[PDB]
Design a protein around this ligand. Sequence first.
Ligand SMILES: CCCCCCCCCCCCCC[C@@H](O)[C@@H](O)[C@H](CO[C@H]1O[C@H](CO)[C@H](O)[C@H](O)[C@H]1O)NC(=O)CCCCCCCCCC
Ligand SMILES: *[C@@H]1O[C@H](CO)[C@@H](O[C@@H]2O[C@H](CO)[C@@H](O)[C@H](O)[C@H]2NC(C)=O)[C@H](O)[C@H]1NC(C)=O
Ligand SMILES: *[C@@H]1O[C@H](CO)[C@@H](O)[C@H](O)[C@H]1NC(C)=O
Lengths: 273, 98
Amino acid sequence: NYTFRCLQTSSFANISWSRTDSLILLGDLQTHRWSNDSAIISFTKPWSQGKLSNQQWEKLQHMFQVYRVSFTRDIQELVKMMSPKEDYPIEIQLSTGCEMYPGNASESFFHVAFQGKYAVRFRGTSWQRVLGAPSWLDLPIKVLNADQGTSATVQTLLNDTWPQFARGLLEAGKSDLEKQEKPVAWLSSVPSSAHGHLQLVCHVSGFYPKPVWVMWMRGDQEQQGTHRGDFLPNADETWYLQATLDVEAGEEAGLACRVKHSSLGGQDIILYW
Amino acid sequence: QKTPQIQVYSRHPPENGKPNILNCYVTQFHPPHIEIQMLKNGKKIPKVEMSDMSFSKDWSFYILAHTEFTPTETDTYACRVKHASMAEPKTVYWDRDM
Ligand SMILES: CCCCCCCCCCCCCC[C@@H](O)[C@@H](O)[C@H](CO[C@H]1O[C@H](CO)[C@H](O)[C@H](O)[C@H]1O)NC(=O)CCCCCCCCCC
Ligand SMILES: *[C@@H]1O[C@H](CO)[C@@H](O[C@@H]2O[C@H](CO)[C@@H](O)[C@H](O)[C@H]2NC(C)=O)[C@H](O)[C@H]1NC(C)=O
Ligand SMILES: *[C@@H]1O[C@H](CO)[C@@H](O)[C@H](O)[C@H]1NC(C)=O
């Protein structure tokens, strides 16, 4: 399963000043870039056009261009007219795309965060406020829903454009999405405030794809105290991850870090302290 | 307003005198306006690349700073972040053992 996503971040500060920046991702790989400074969508992968011919991508691309100017003035008009509070500053985050299921099954979405919080969704033919969002948003939502020309475009996006474009992206970037880069492990330890206690760290960097298995072992036994950190990104879109184990002094001898990854075959990395 | 979290880590196993890449991964902050510098001996490194501002499914922003560096016995490295949720810049130092 891969999530195709257009992620837009929009900031409105004072009556003159706004900027909208966005990127597109397929899974954990970035496929497109659109800074506020550029007039036109960039590719960040060789396959970022997917299967669209030039003519159709240019149509999608011009659609983005009109939207960005239309979106900017709309928000400010909507907020100036109906926001019961001051009409600046406005932070908007926007996520629309579709989740890809194996066998040509998709599920589209269009989510909007207002001042850092989930506020609006688009389902069927209309925008709908979500639970917890400021009730006054009901009025700008109703005004947006009276624009069936925009409603129909969004319907086409969610029903056709995102599923069909992302299926072509997924197959044009299948080789990239399935490349195998190997992890590389190294070890360190840090003291504890208490005596006789320290923390082993198994650093694992450079692996792709993301799923990985890192454990502290004493021979056959997994040390259940192993604490896996968060997946951290590298600049080359490989992944970094560390796992920690608090041990009493002297218990480190004979402990190893075992790394299971799809790039190694069955040959685990086993790195003793 | 949410306070950023800062994680500093190297791309490859650190080895003194061998060129490497230092990463600074900054998350959980809101609003997205943020200033991130990477420092060598308290001095700001000139060539520091940033990723495009993105956010996770829970709407938490995240951004990756990275720069080339050669770890050493003497030099300190740090990532310094300024954000409206904090009265003061937060600096977290690179420690190869952490
Ligand atoms: C108060 C806070 C509310 C937050 C809730 C946010 C709601 C979701 C965001 C709505 C985004 C739409 C914004 C633009 C839309 O207001 C409309 O002006 C344009 C152009 O509309 C005019 O021109 C059209 C032809 O270009 C057409 O004739 C319209 O009838 C006319 O009114 N609407 C559009 O550009 C439709 C494109 C839909 C956006 C698809 C691109 C979004 C992709 C984001 C990654
Ligand atoms: C896009 O797909 C949605 C379904 O997700 C369609 O929604 C239906 O729209 C009709 C009116 O056109 C409503 O009476 C139904 O209740 C809607 N169904 C649901 C489940 O909400 C929508 O019409 C489609 N639009 C296009 C242009 O294909
Ligand atoms: C964003 O782009 C628009 C049009 O390209 C421009 O008018 C505006 O000044 C830009 N915002 C910033 C902050 O530069």
